[PDB]
Structure formats: C-alpha cells, structure tokens
Design a protein around this ligand. Structure first.
Ligand SMILES: [Ca+2]
Ligand SMILES: [Ca+2]
Ligand SMILES: [Ca+2]
Ligand SMILES: [Ca+2]
Lengths: 291, 291, 253, 315, 291, 85
C-alpha cells in the first residue's frame, strides 16, 4: 500500500464580489506533482522523476474563523487544465465534481483517479492539457472580505515511474520596466502577475506559504532599503550590500499565503530600476546571516 | 519491487602514499540519506521524512583512465560510523565488505541490508554510531598521483516511514578569524576543513560535484574581486556589490567534484576580512543573473 | 441555468420535473431579518411592494434569515416552448417566477444563498439558437431585445442626451459591441458591478461610435452603472451584442 | 441520486465537556498539560521552549505525578496516547489550535503555516470546537532519562507541539488533556530529583544530575543581572550560588510569587540565596526569578526541588 | 518472432571537457522511427505508416581505438524527449537506463519497451514529449580529444499499424543571410545549426554517415567552385553550372559521419550569396554524373 | 457537426462509436469521373497531390461518380478532449 500525504494548498480568503483562485489566474492549481502550490512536499520528490500516476485524491477544506462571517467556499475539479476560470457565481453547478458550502463548516470532495502514466512538467510544454490531470478551482462569494476563512488540505497517494537527474528547485525571474515576471529553469513559486517595478521602487507578492531565500540582483543607480511585511516577517538578519550599478541583497522570510494589499517583499527609495533578477529556494530558519 | 537510484558518490583521485577519502575526513560518507555526498538526489526525498530503511546497496567503481597508470582503489563498508581511518594497508581488506582492485578496471560490492528503521540526520546528533547505517571509505595507495582515475556509483532501494515538513536545502556556514567552518541548519555541501580565511583573502574547496548558488556576505573594509578556480567554472554572471562594511556577492557555479590545489571559489584583494557567511542551494544553469 | 442554456439552444420543448428551493444560511443567531421564497404561476406579474403579499402568495416559505428554508414546487406534464425568437406574451411559455423577498434586516451583508434543483427533459431538437443579444434603445424608450437570450432586461439601461448606462446583473464575463449614434466622441468606464479586462479598444469615425468591451460582472447591487458611456452629445440609438466570452477574447494594444 | 445532496448542519453555540474522576484496585490517567492561550501572529508551545513537551515519564511537564514513580524504574513503554483538547469558549472567537506529534524528539517547531497541517499525525481544528488526536504505540522498551544523555532521540518517544495562530489573543481559550497507560520494567534504587544547572557568560544552561525542570532556552546572564523563566507550574525551592563581586537583590517576577521569606546572604566571592516561589507556567515578559544589581556575574549554579509551602525559611 | 535491425547511430568523438551529442543539440536522437540518425534503414519502412511500437531496444557501443587513450563514454535514455542536456557529471548516472564505461572497452544497454502506439513524426509537432519514445544522449567527458573512439549500434523489433502513402525521402532547406537552416517537408539529414553562410561563402556539416545527393541552388552574382571537405569525399563527378543569378550544382558524396573542423561540403569564391536551397536524397555510388 | 457543436461546448471528453460514409450519387450513367473517400488516423497530414496516394491510404473507397459508395471506420475506446482553448 501507498503512503498518504496531507498537504496545505491555500489559506482561503473570503471575498465580497466574486473571486477565483484568489489573486491568481487559472494556471496555479495544475494537477502535476511539479507544482509547489498543490504539492509543497512532493515537489521535492517530483524533481527526481518523469512519470507519475495518482491513486487517491481528497480535498479537505477545514475552517478557521468563528461562525459569524457568512461565505461560500467552493472546490471544483476540471478534467481539463486549459479551460478558463469560471466567470459568474452561477457557473459553478455546471462542473462535474464540486462541493460548495458555507465558510464556517468543513467539507470533503473525492476525485476519481485514472490509471494512465503522465509526464511530470519540467518545461515549457505548450499543451498542459495532455500532461496535467486537471485543474482545481476555488471560489468565494458572499462577503467577509479581508478575513482568513479557512485552509484547504489535500491528500495523495502518488507513485512515480522512471527516474531523472534532479530538476533544479530554484526559480530565476527577470523583470524589465513595463515587463512582467518571466520564469527561467523552473519551478513555479512565483506567477507572472506577482510583481511590479517603477522607476524607483519594487515589490513581490508571495502566496505559497513557505520560508524562502531571495537573492535580489537589482540594477539601480542609488541604494535602497528593503522592507518585509504584509504577509511575511523577516527572520531578521537581512544583509544587503552595494557596490557598482548592481544592488545585491539576501533575505530570509516566512510567508503565510494569505492575500494582502501590501507587497510581501518591497524595495524602495532608490532611483532608475531597470532589471530585477531573483532566485528563490524554500530554505529553513537556520539559513540566515549573522550580523 | 522498489526503484533503484544510481547516484554519483566521488570522482577518485589517486595518490602515491595513502589516502582515505581523497583528503577529506572520516565524516563525509555517513550512510544517512541526509548526506548529499552519498545521496545527491535522494536527499530531497529524504528531507520529508524521519525514518528510513535501506534495502539494496551496491558499489561499482567505474574507471575513466587509460591502462597505463598503476594504482589501486579500494571500497570499504564499516558497520560503525565512528571508527577511524584505515591507517595501514593490512587494515584495508580486513573490513566486513571490501573490494580492492586496480585503477584501470571496474569493480562491484554489495552490502547486506538490515530491516531496522533509523532516524534521518536532523541538525544535531553526537552518537552517529546509532543513527547512520555505516561509513563508506575509499582508499587509494599506490602511484597514480593526482590524475582523475574513475568514479564510484551507488544504488539504493530506500523506503521512508512517517512524514515531516521539509528541513533544509540551504546551508548557513560562518567563519571567523582563526576559526573554521561551523554550519547552522543545513545539509553538507561543505564540510569544517574545506575553507580558509586570512586577513585579506578567502577560499572554498567544494568537492561534491553539483551546480550551486552562493551568497557571500563578507564583513570587509575594501572591495575585492571573486574568481572561480580549477575545480569549478562560472556561468558568466557573477554579479556582486559593495556598500557598507559588508561585501555581498551571489555566484552560480558548477563544480566537477575533483581535487585540485586551487580553491574552487576564491575571494581575494580586500583587507580586514573578519566574518564570511554562506548560503548554498544547488541550483541549475538557470538562476544566473542577467546583466 | 447558466450551463443548461447552451443545451437548451439545441431543443424546442421542455418540462420541469423536480423543483426545490433550498436557502442555506451563512450567519449565526445574532442577525435579525426575514427571507421569503415565492413561486408564481404567472410569469408576468409584478412583485411586492408590501408586507401583505409576501406571506400568502400561493406557495411560499418565509422563515428568518439565520434559519434554513426549503420550498418545493409541484410540476406539470405539459410541454412548453423554449424561448427562442422572443415572443411577447411570455406567460404561456415560462413555468413561472421566483421572487426572493427580504426585509427588516441586517443590511447589506452576505446573509445566505439560494440553491435550485431541476430535472429538465427536452423534446425535439433545433439546429441551434443564436446566443447573442441585440438590444436597441431610443430616447425616452427602454430596451427592446431581439434575437435572444435574456441577459439584459428592459429595466436595466437608461440613455440621456449625453450619457449612457447599463446595469448588468447576470454575473458572467461578457463581450459588448457598443454602437452609439452620437455627434461627438466619448469615454467608456466600467462601474461597480464589474471590472475590465483592461484593454477595451474603441474608435470613432462617422456618426456611429463603436466600442468593444470585455467585462466581468458580479451581479451584486451597486448604485453606479456597470458599463457607462458618458461625455458625448446627442445620443439617439444604442445597439448591443453580448456574448459571454472568457478572458482571452479581449483585444490587444 | 439527483447528483446534489443537500445536508444541513446546525452549529449550536458553545460546546463544552465535563470531566469526572472515579477513581476506583491499589491504568488510564488523564492530566492537564496546558491552558491554550491564543495568539494573533504565530506561536508554538505557547511561549515555552522548543523542546518542552517530550514523551518520557521523567518529564515534569507531561507527568508531574508519575515522575516520582518513574525514578524507581529504568524501562518504560507507552500503550495508549490520546490528546483531547477541550474548548472553554463560545462560537464567537475565531482562531486555530493544532496538536502535533513528532517521532523525533529533537526537531524544531514551525515557524510557518506550511508545517502545521501535514506533519505526520496532526489535528488542526478551530478554537471553539473540540479535537481528539490518537498516537499509535510501539512495543519497544526505552530508557527512562536518568544521568542525562545527549542524543535524547533514542530515549524519548516524541514531542508534542501545540501550535496556535490567528486569534483571539491572550485569552483562556481551551485546555489540553493527555491519557497514558505507562508500564515500567526493572527497578532502580531511585533517581536524584534535584537539578544542577550551570551558566557561563555567553553560554546557556547545561543541566546535570536530572530531571528537566529548566531547559537551556530559559535563562540569561549578563555582566550584572540574571533571570530565569520557570515554565513548569509548581512550587519550587532554589539555591542560587552566583559568583559575583558585589551583593544584589532577588525579585520574583510575573510567572510566580514568593512565599515571602526568601533569605539570602553574601560573604566571599559567592552569593548564596534560597527562594521558595510558586509558578503558574503562563507567559509573562518578565523573568520569573530575577537577580539584578550586582557586578561581574560569571557562574550561576542551581538546585531545584519542588517543595511545598512549608519548606520556607523563617525571619 | 520479429526481425532485429542492427543500425549505426554515431561514431563517437571524444572530448576533454563535457559534450552531449558530440556537439549537436538535444534534438538529434528522438526515438521516432522517422529519424535518420537513429534509423538509417527503418525510416524507409516507417515512411509508409502512421503508428509504431517498439519491442526490443539495445545499445552496444563498440570501440575502435587502441588501449592507450583514457576517456569515458556514457549512454543515456530519457523517457522524456524534451529534457535538457546533462550539464554536469553527477547527472550522467542518474538517468533511468544508463551505462558508462571507458573508451577502449565495449558496453551494452537494454531499454524496457511499452505497448502503446505512438504517431510517427509528420512534418510538424510541437510537443514531441507525447509522440517520441524518448531521447538518447551520448556523453563523453574526459581526455580523448577529438580522435575517433568507437561507434554505437542499435537494435529494434518495430511493428507498425495502419498504412499511409510515402511521405518524404528528400529534404528542402533554405538559408537566408543571418538566418539558419529551416527545413520544409523532409526528414533530417541536416539539422538548424549545421550550415553557415557569409556574403561570399557557404558550408555544410553533415554528421549522419550516408551517401547523399545534393542540389545546390544558390542565388549568386559570380560563379564559385565546390570542394568536399574532411568528413566526406567526392565520387569524382561533381558537375555544376552557372547561368542567370542562380548557381546550380549537383554532387554525390559519401560522409563518414565524424566530427571535423572543416565543412563537409563547402562553396566559396563567389560574391553576394543570399539564398541557398537544398535537396538531399541518400543515393548510392551509382547516380554520379558521367563526364 | 453543425448541430452537435453546441452540445459539444458543454462537455470535455468524447468518443465516436459508429462511423459510416455513404456517398449518394445524383447523376445517370453518362458522366465519367471518380470520387474517393479517405480516412486518416493522423489529423495533421496533407492531402494528395497525386493519383498514387488516393487508392492505398489505409481505409479508402474509390468508386466511380455515378455509382454509390459506403465506407466504415473502425472505432476505439479512448476518451479524447473536445477542442477548446
Ligand atoms: Ca523530465
Ligand atoms: Ca398573476
Ligand atoms: Ca524529524
Ligand atoms: Ca500521417
């Protein structure tokens, strides 16, 4: 028999109007084990292999808030991985596997598994449709806007066929003025609508809920302070440096996955930001820098 | 059933007199799966669990050299993990599982496995003797002075018992003047006698053969260039910076894991080096910083 | 029926077998109020407009806000036309109304939500039905829909001599084509019920003014028009096409 | 069969539990462990050390009564293990309490939201609603921790971690109960139930002679001051022996109060006191026993005994 | 049951540093039977069908060199067909099926086969990952600099499902100034980074080891002679002609399929080369043009 | 499928069970010619572009213009995606 793995997926933040996978597109919750959002602990095993096959899948929304904040969390599975995110509130019952209850009460949803071996995404494939097992979509619509409602767990029995040299679990992203985040050599901790640069400032929203390690490489002309807040606190040893036209810093912070209308990591005060290069690693608290 | 895992352990560098782990101490090849020298890929899987159990264990040293160089390579398995090095030649064949042949010709060695569950190395043990499954020692003792001779692979069927969150992909090591490497919360990826500092210079010997990401945080007074030595090469993007009394650099380099009498990463030219702090991540040929 | 309406385009007759309404609360026993659920056999009556009419309609459940309801509607055996190529007397076509009256709250809070169950069966098939509205407004008039379906309804839009507004309350993601007979240019903003997928490309030219917007509405009330065109002069006709398109059918700068 | 199943849930109001003892014989044994103090940001074992709850019978936090019977034996098992969080609050206060068991006894604690859910064996419900966690047992015999070992991983059975976040700040939210059937194999004479802990400048606590009342992240020394954060909740008996150059005063902080006849004395380079205090184990950001006002503190040596309110000295 | 098919794949040219398909990209050895590098004879049978199924797959690298040259040759089978190259040494043995020995000594490697039917490559795919059966990679990494070391054979039992008309024996490739090779309706037989043009010259590197028939159609302004380089030799009948702005040649040459730092077919001496169009046919020692 | 394409929008997977092609003539035995009906297992090949490729594709019926044809296509059991996005 296999081994179950309970894994944290989201911290569900409620909404008033209508909202999909909360701040993000219909790209986040792909059913591949090469996805840090749905698989925070199996992505390290998924870097060693190229074929997977799912056996048991349950979603387990567990509430956290007091029973005073009305809401409706829905959990939806697609067989596609390229269908668009749902548009209305009432385009929810038209899916195949769906559980939609109130915010304050726990749920469950079982997903029937196939028997086909599928590729583990270390790419840059064009068709995600034939690779993934499907999407997971999470919808909130009543109210109780800025409140951590609950959190969604996920249980798996994943087996892997033929191995591989390890896919490098360190991102590498580049921003230009007017550009977006563009990943390089994987994985997908950051999605492209997660950052912004100006002529003087810089910011990153991080919602995967881990403890990470940055290496800022920012091309500016003056120095700038680096503040960490909103979703994440410093494991406070953030040592930066200046020199030539580069700006180099290294940060250890612990995000919490919750949305906020403040960037998690923010760089301000400088002038003429042109490029920002990143590396994120998912480290632990012992990887700080002694003053 | 299981899945085998062929993994690179060393690249054997021959020596005239007598040498046990081609220079490194009797600490390198502990048979825990939390040991990146022995498990460059399984340590990512093993960072999620607390108990393990080995099922199949084989060597297979494989040569790389022409049949012109005399020499002798031996492979050794202690059941202890705290015995000392094999000081003489008569001690080499006296171990429980030992195979010793010439340099130019291949070998194999099987280790009989137990059925007990042992803990995975987490941040501190003192009696390794009860946690590890044993050592591996690799003696070379006649004249094939330091030419690359061959390399040693290792096969496993490893199963793990109850899970855990991820522990540490990243090291933190700190050097003071006169002191040595002291790691804090990571794997290893370095070990103490593999770095040296002076009043003005700095060096790292990396013999693990991966592709890494450093963050040099060096308390200096003046700037200093960073070269990449004979063991390893850059990917030509070593963006660094100065600022306050710190010196901050971030390098992506790939090492062959071979002995050389040059530091693999060297930092010289400055003055009054007092502390050096590190973070090593094992990236890929991605995360380099675009100019 | 945001999903069955596409399958309803391929058929002509329908029944309705099982009908339950299953209001689920989302609130503690702290907030007062009342929610009532009403089914009419007419499909063209008005709504209360009193407390007198809420209780005894014919078939109504009117419990409190914090407590669950359940209403069942008895069915028939008749076959009725699916509404295509819009009729006027839509009383012999529809099966009835739902009315959903609340009062004496607990003001604008997510109190609960209403679920609806159906077993719908369809008799003989069509080729399709054109799922794109065509609605026209004149000065002083209202919306008059052509070509079907019923995204917008006649008390949803207003025109002036210089401005224009739509209150889209269906909660999807849509695709407009404004064709407005003006004399000057103007701007189009997206109000409270909805947001852009922000590359709405428009153009002026002759007496027409042609835009093409992609917005995502939520259906919640707001006292701003969800799509507003203002700043022009001498608006006389506004013609529409709405399509329910996803977030990839936007134009590109 | 209509493909959508409506199920109704009636969340009533405050749920509580009522606990009686019988007790009968000359063995399940329920005990309190903590009172769960909710916090806003993120917190482990609620301000206590990173190592505190630790499955030996020679552990004062989990077994304040069995630790005396554990001194007379060497081996132990643990048969039945349940954790039975009982709420004390209505459905009005938000928050989350999680209960975690490690198979290690030397890991650290989260330090994230990521690590709370999937540890291996964890129950993570809300504050106002009851939990129940069971731990599967083994059949091995392990040493009772006497004459303190270093690698206490092969000795203990594991940890308990008790993580709360996103409260409901510092309110008596609930409390955690613990059940055991402990059996003991071959007996000792006794074990010395008096700690001996030593601090140097820059160092931490290093315990000798056992048991584990104080743990190394509980004390701090300076050149002139000294402080202890006793978080075990008993009534104790100290003997401060502090190597100073001047005299000083000893006050009793927030976690504890005197039985107010603490007699101390100065003399040679030593400074010797003897205090009887009663601690509560709740957090407070004051040292529970504080010695300040002196100069050149180098060593502080301790003896702690768990004595009742009659072992105080008399003016 | 079937009929085995021993087929020449490469001729291994050793290199000092690290090299993956002796220079050519990670596109060459796709395991479709529409791949003339891996199937120099079965591609004619495979041009009649749409589905295929591999049954037996073996290597057998065979050396050609004296036992005086040190070196190491490795043979690799990805199950992916879109993974990147093995950047370092530790990645070599970490594949699913991998055998690595010295240069002077023979090997073998068996690949376990599936039972699925996959499409044969017809003129365009983007996700090769679902069409091919995998890659083959051939790493050499120590010092036997570029001497012919050995050659690698390949064995198959291939069965095909439902037929089709013949597709393409002949390539059409077009080069513009600054551009690269872009093939139109053929096999390959060339691949892009194997030709170079200047304002006055032209060259082709052919590493497939067959006997071909070219038709050079080069838009020139002046004439130019055509030589046949170091990889390949003429059969001495290279009749060419000039006329209008086109230059038309037709050559029959036989290539050994070995690396050389000379273009195998070179066209120089003219001026203002703008387009070069090709057609390659794999003739025999017949079709040369009698003077 | 000008009618099923609307019902195909409401689903993701499909099969095809029975496939017949049933060319019906509308002309006497006076007009010469040839009509062939071809099924590929590919969906991205090109078309002939010769007389050579018409006859032996894999599964083809190639009678005259004035005379009736009938071609059947064997099915599979696999589920395939409806082409969306
Ligand atoms: Ca791969
Ligand atoms: Ca009426
Ligand atoms: Ca552990
Ligand atoms: Ca085809």
């Amino acid at each position: 028999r296999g081994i179950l793995h309970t894994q944290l997926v989201m911290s569900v933040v409620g909404s008033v109007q209508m909202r999909t996978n909360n701040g993000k597109s219909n790209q986040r919750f792909r059913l591949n084990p090469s996805n840090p959002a749905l698989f925070p602990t199996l992505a390290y095993e998924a870097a060693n292999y190229d074929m997977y096959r799912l056996k048991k899948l349950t979603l387990r929304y567990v509430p956290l808030v007091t029973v005073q904040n009305s809401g409706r969390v829905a959990m939806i599975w697609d067989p596609d991985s390229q269908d668009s995110a749902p548009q209305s509130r009432q385009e929810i019952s038209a899916y195949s596997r769906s559980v939609s209850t109130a915010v304050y009460e726990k749920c469950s949803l079982t997903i029937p598994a196939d028997n086909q071996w599928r590729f583990v995404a270390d790419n840059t494939t064009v068709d995600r449709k034939l690779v993934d097992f499907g999407q997971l979509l999470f919808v909130t619509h009543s109210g109780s806007d800025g409140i951590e409602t609950g959190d969604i767990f996920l249980d798996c029995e994943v087996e892997f066929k033929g191995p591989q040299p390890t896919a490098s679990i360190v991102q590498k992203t580049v921003i230009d003025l007017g550009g977006t985040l563009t990943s390089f050599e994987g994985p997908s901790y950051l999605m492209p609508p997660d950052a912004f640069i100006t002529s003087s400032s810089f910011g990153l929203f991080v919602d995967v809920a881990g403890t990470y390690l940055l290496t800022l490489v920012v091309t500016c002309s003056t120095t700038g302070s680096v503040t960490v807040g909103g979703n994440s606190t410093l494991v406070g040893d953030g040592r930066a440096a200046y020199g030539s036209s580069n700006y180099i810093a290294s940060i250890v912070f612990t995000s919490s996955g919750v949305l906020s209308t403040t960037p998690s990591v923010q760089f301000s005060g400088s002038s003429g930001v042109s490029r920002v290069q990143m590396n994120i690693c998912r480290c632990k608290q012992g990887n700080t820098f002694i003053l």
